[PDB]
Amino acid sequence: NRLKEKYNKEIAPALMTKFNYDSVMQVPKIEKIVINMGVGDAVQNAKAIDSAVEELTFIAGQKPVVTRAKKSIAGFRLREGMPIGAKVTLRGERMYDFLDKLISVSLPRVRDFRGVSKKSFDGRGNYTLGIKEQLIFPEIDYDKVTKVRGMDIVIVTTANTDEEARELLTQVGMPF
Amino acid sequence: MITKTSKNAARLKRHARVRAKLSGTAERPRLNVFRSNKHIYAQIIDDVNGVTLASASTLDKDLNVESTGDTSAATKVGELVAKRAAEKGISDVVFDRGGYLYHGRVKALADAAREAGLKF
Amino acid sequence: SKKGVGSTKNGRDSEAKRLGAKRADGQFVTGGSILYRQRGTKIYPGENVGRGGDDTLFAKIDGTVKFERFGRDRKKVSVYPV
Amino acid sequence: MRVNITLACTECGERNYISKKNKRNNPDRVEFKKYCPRDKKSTLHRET
Amino acid sequence: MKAGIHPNFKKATVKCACGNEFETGSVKEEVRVEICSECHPFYTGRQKFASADGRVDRFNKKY
Amino acid sequence: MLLPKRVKYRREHRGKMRGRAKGGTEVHFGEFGIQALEASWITNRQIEAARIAMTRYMKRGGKVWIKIFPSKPYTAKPLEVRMGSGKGAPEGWVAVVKPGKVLFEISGVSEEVAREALRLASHKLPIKTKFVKRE
RNA sequence: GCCGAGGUGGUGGAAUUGGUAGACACGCUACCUUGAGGUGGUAGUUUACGGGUUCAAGUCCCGUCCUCGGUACCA
RNA sequence: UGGUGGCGAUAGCGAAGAGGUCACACCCGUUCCCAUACCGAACACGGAAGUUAAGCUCUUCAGCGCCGAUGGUAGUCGGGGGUUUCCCCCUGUGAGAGUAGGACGCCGCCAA
RNA sequence: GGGGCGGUCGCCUCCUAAAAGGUAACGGAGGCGCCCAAAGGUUCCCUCAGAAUGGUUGGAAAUCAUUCGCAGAGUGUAAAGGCACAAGGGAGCUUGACUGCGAGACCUACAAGUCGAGCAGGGACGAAAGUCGGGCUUAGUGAUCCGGUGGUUCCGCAUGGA
RNA sequence: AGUCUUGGAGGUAGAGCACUGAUUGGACUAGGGGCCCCUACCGGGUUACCGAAUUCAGUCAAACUCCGAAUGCCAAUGACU
């Protein structure tokens, strides 16, 4: 709730008069957040899928999809199927809640934390957080952690060029 | 970037899937449905002649409704479709739900035309 | 001298199946008669022509036969009455 | 392996049908409702 | 939203050991935190403890 | 030994030699070239011997520019074997040379040396050939 | 070049897809015994190759290399 | 303007513009119908705070794409001749490539 | 291209094959003697491979978003033909992988083989229109004789049975 | 039955590279070696020693077609013969 009001009131006039848009609708909005999991031990660890079907339901209560491999790879011992990786897409109120979890609460707990990279924008206006330790925001509970499998967060704006997505995500609260 | 295609582009595609299997023949004219945000529209089309025979819209200042986008607006425009289809006597017609479900305002149109006397 | 090498390995071949036009353009054609034996749809069914289970194009009604075209680069059989 | 399957009726007991199935992908005795021309209706059939 | 599949979400009154409170919506109704942002010392400019501690040995000639 | 590294079908028909060449009828990579006045099959070894004669006479070649490559294989049954029982095993590779096809070219070298260089190339070829300047 | 056969540890060599640097007999290494050797006693070292199939590969399959032999030019 | 059709992208792509009171939309939410292998993104159910930026229309233009001659040529039916794994001549036919150019919408129907 | 050896014997796809169809050789290549209870039916949905970037362990290449991609992918399986209105992908519901047929056609010496609108009986899906008599088409198979099994207002050596 | 007019199906000869294979050279070009320097194979420094993928320009194909004949073939339509 609070990040929407922060976004509207503080950000939309400031970003609108910072980048001089020809309409109110050109102002970029964070549309969706995609949480990749990328568990490839489903082949080698048949139970492991429940790991991050267990964990990513607790990471965000939208249950991730047990996603399947679309092409057979012989070097990985894997036919089409044998499902690989979980996936959350996120738009609504929980997503500004999730960036509220990331910015203000979680990103201190990165145990080697510095400026997360400026050079992680694709050239279109979208961002990914590459996570190496799956316990960052306090729900994850070391007690309930054996497999350390991290996470990929894909923050997707509606930005047409890239540095205005930069100036969006700096102003929302992501440090760099 | 992220860009999405329109409702209208996917709607015309999902309509063009529908159009391969039913057309506005003689004595089964095609009863088409368009679903604007603020109104709803319904034509009765011959596809051999390329001519719509009867028509009814909620964009009619006569016999207006308040909400105009409600399911009751769709029921009133469906009975108007069938009423104009009764005044020019086709009496038997084939329902084109146009790239939509058979669910809401479209199903309200269709149920209203089935009640008022268009034999789908 | 006759030094022995054998084993062609390539004798066999399948039996010729007679795909292609069985009726022509402007031909009078009764109902149910095969207009075009094919594999795939090299030519599509148009008006009053049905595509079979072995995707042959057959005529549903009596009438003349026309091979028109489907616009861009694509053909069509259609049977019209008189 | 793939086995030839007769599908005998239950209302009539008459055989009337054959299709094939696996002994491994379908290890149990399979049943369908088909048309019994003695019963002149749709009837549950049964592998025998 | 599918019913019976997702866990619940209540208004999380996220605390911190520095006392700073914040509001989100989570699985947990209330969350206790040991280090928030405003508690973490990197956000608070040049910190007291670790920047006063992280002085390398000044070539201990003294005696 | 110019060899295509891979061929779809190792045994092809012998084809026919009629009509002029589709292309390469004119010299544009080099300065001085050699056309075929007749049609033939030129094997690996004729391009080898001609190109070696070219390189040995020019003694420092600007560019040598071989336009024909032996794509077609020709098969041959072994010696003293009756007819039939399959096509023979492949022995060699052949460039098909239609009439009016620029075979070799020369750049950066004067006209008389190019004449005599393409002449030593021409006496290794089965064809009647002529010298061709750039137009 | 063609056909047929085998390519394991230093050696000869068994292994019907199911655990082998080796399971079996020798060598080999470290120790013991003996004055010092031998015998004897104790412990110890990826299947010609590369790419698959498989939950599992020496094995099943596709290709490359080597050696035995038969089948040829020639002396 | 909005919907719906036929016509071979001469309709396209791409580039630069303009328009909103109506109209189509972008939008605002899910309380019920419905939905999302995840999710009001979609699909549905509703609304009208603002938005001409996008779709949408409406102009130009030949950068890619498309259509595309005439001539000439390769080929070839038929006749003929030669040193005949080929070549030449005659009557008729006649590409492909390349081009000059055409083209960034024509034509219907219905509702405003 | 003497006979033996080798190789082959039936069916499907391409090239030979000469722009209908056909067409031979011990011509060039390949496959078949099946698989699938969903890999069938219908309804509703929807779009592929790669590349460039952002991304731990993730590697050249799993999964992710993100633009560009009317086609290389996919199509159970050789190969051809065909397909993005899907024939390619999902999910629900399902058994038409129905019975009696079948005007008329293709094919062909025959035996055979293939296509078939439509009708009736009963259903499946769908609101309906409709579609469904297996799969994307073409391979996945063999006559008769003799026996087995199941069912039948059939006959049954004088009659009733057998 | 022939021929003229007309409508079709079919993709060879030819041609072209738009697929699929083959393939000549130049331009760059991640990278693989080799001379080595020290040195945790770490960081590099070079070479006209090879180069995957990009581009321009050229070739070729029975099982390659963005294309496409002349003929032959199937017809109808009249016309004669």
Coordinates of C-alpha atoms (C1' of nucleotides) in Angstrom, one line a residue, chain A residues 22-26 29 62-63 65 87 89 91, chain H residues 26-28 30 37-39 41 50-53:
Chain A
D22 CA 4.5 14.5 -23.3
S23 CA 1.8 12.7 -21.3
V24 CA 1.0 11.3 -17.9
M25 CA 0.9 7.8 -19.4
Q26 CA 4.5 7.9 -20.6
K29 CA 5.6 2.0 -13.9
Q62 CA 1.7 -17.0 -5.1
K63 CA 2.7 -20.6 -5.7
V65 CA 4.8 -23.1 -11.5
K87 CA 8.6 -19.3 -11.7
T89 CA 5.0 -13.6 -11.9
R91 CA 1.5 -7.8 -10.3
Chain H
rC26 C1' -5.1 3.2 -22.6
rC27 C1' -7.0 3.5 -17.5
rC28 C1' -9.4 2.5 -12.1
rU30 C1' -12.2 -7.2 -8.0
rA37 C1' -0.4 -25.2 -13.9
rC38 C1' 1.5 -18.6 -11.2
rC39 C1' -1.4 -13.5 -11.5
rA41 C1' -1.3 -9.6 -17.4
rG50 C1' -7.0 11.2 -16.6
rU51 C1' -4.8 9.9 -21.3
rU52 C1' -3.4 11.4 -26.4
rA53 C1' 1.8 9.3 -25.2

